[PDB]
Structure 1
Amino acid sequence: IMSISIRLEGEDDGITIFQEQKPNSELSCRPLCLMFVDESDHETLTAILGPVVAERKAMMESRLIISVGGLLRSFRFFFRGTGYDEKMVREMEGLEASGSTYICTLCDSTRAEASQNMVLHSITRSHDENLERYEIWRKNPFSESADELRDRVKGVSAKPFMETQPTLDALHCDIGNATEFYKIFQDEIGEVYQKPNPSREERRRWRSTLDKQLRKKMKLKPVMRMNGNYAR
Structure 2
Amino acid sequence: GLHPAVCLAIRVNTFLSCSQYHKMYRTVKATSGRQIFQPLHTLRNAEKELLPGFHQFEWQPALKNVSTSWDVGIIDGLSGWTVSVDDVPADTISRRFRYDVALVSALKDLEEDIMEGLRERALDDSMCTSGFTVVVKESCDGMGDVSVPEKAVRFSFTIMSISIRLEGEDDGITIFQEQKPNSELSCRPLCLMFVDESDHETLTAILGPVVAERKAMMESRLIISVGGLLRSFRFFFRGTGYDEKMVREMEGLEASGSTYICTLCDSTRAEASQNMVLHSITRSHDENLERYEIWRKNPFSESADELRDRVKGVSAKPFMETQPTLDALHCDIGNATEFYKIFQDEIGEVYQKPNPSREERRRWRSTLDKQLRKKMKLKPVMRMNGNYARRLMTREAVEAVCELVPSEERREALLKLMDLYLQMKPVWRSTCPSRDCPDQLCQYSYNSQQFADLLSSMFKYRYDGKITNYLHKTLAHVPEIVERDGSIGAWASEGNESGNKLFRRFRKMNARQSKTFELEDILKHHWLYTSKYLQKFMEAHK
Alignment TM class, shorter chain as reference: over 0.9
Give the Å deviation of 1:23.
Answer: 1.1
Q: Which residue of 2 aligns with 1:35?
A: 193
Q: Deviations over 1:121-163 (max 9, x none)?
A: 0000101110000000000000001100001111200101010
Secondary structure of the equivalent of 1:74? strand
TM-fit CA distance, 1:190: 1.1
Provide the residue aligned with 1:69 in structure 2: 227
1:171 to 302, 311, 329: 329
Deviations 1:12-61 (A, max 9, x none): 01100101110101000100000111101101110011110000011010
Q: Distance in 1 between matches of 2:384 and 2:211?
A: 33
CA distance in 2, matches of 1:190, 1:116: 27
Q: Deviations over 1:53-99 (max 9, x none)?
A: 00001101010111111011100001000001111000000110001
- Distance (Å, rounded) in 1 between the aligned partners of 2:176 and 2:269: 42
TM-score by length of 2: 0.42
Structure 2 gap segments, 5+ residues each: 1-158, 389-542
| Alignment of 1:7 onto 2:165 | yes
- Alpha-carbon distance, 1:9 to partner: 1.4
Q: Give the alignment of 1:184-199 within 5 angstroms.
A: 184-199=342-357
Q: CA deviation at 1:191?
A: 1.1
- d(CA) in 2 for partners of 1:97, 1:166: 16
Displacement after TM superposition at 1:186 (Å): 0.4
Give secondary structure in 1 for the equivalent of 2:240.
Answer: coil
- In structure 2, which of residues 252, 255, 265 is the aligned counterpart of residue 107 of structure 1? 265
Larger Rg: 2
- Are 1:201 and 2:362 matched, yes or no? no
Aligned-partner Cα distance in 1 for 2:167–2:358: 68
Equivalent residue in structure 2 for 1:226, among 384, 395, 419: 384
SS in 2 for 1:183: helix
Alpha-carbon deviations, 1:199-232, whole Å to 9, x = none?
11110001111011100001110010010000xx
Name the structure 2 match of 1:161: 319
Taking the aligned partners of 1:208 and 1:75, their CA distance within structure 2 comes to 58
- Taking the aligned partners of 2:363 and 2:342, their CA distance within structure 1 comes to 14
Match of 1:134 in 2: 292
- When you count helix as a share of all residues, which structure comes out higher? 2
Cα displacement (A) at 1:188: 0.2
User: Which SS does the other structure have where 1:33 is aligned?
Assistant: strand
Query: In percent, how many aligned pairs have the same letter?
Result: 100
Q: How far has the Cα of 1:116 moved from its partner?
A: 1.1
Cα distance between partner residues in 2 of 1:166 and 1:155 = 16
Please give the alpha-carbon distance, in whole angstroms, between the structure 1 residues aligned to 2:358 and 2:160.
48
Distance 2:313 2:340 in 1: 32
Q: 1:34 aligns to what SS in structure 2?
A: strand
| Secondary structure, aligned partner of 1:206 | helix
- 2:304 alignment partner in structure 1: 146
User: Alpha-carbon deviation of 1:8?
Assistant: 1.1
For 1:155 and 1:142, the matched residues in 2 are separated by: 17
SS of aligned partner of 1:17:
strand
Match of residue 91 from structure 1: 249
Q: TM-score, normalised by structure 1?
A: 0.98
Secondary structure of residue in 2 paired with 1:75 = strand
- Provide the alpha-carbon RMSD of the alignment: 0.6
d(CA) in 1 for partners of 2:273, 2:224: 53
CA distance in 2 between partners of 1:198 and 1:17 (Å): 58
> CA offsets, 1:164-209, max 9 Å, x none?
0000110000000000000000000011111110111110001111
1:59 lines up with 2:217 in the alignment:
yes
Q: Name the SS of the counterpart of 1:156 in structure 2.
A: coil
Q: Give the number of aligned pairs.
A: 230
Which secondary structure does the structure 2 equivalent of 1:79 belong to?
strand
- Give secondary structure in 1 for the equivalent of 2:162: strand
The CA distance in 1 between the partners of 2:226 and 2:370, in whole Å, is 61
Number of the residue aligned with 2:413: none
| 3-state SS in 2 of match to 1:80 | strand
Name the residue aligned to 1:121. Answer: 279
Secondary structure of the residue aligned to 2:236 is coil
2:175 is paired with a residue of what secondary structure? Answer: strand
Deviating beyond 3 angstroms after TM superposition, the runs of 4 or more aligned structure 1 residues are none
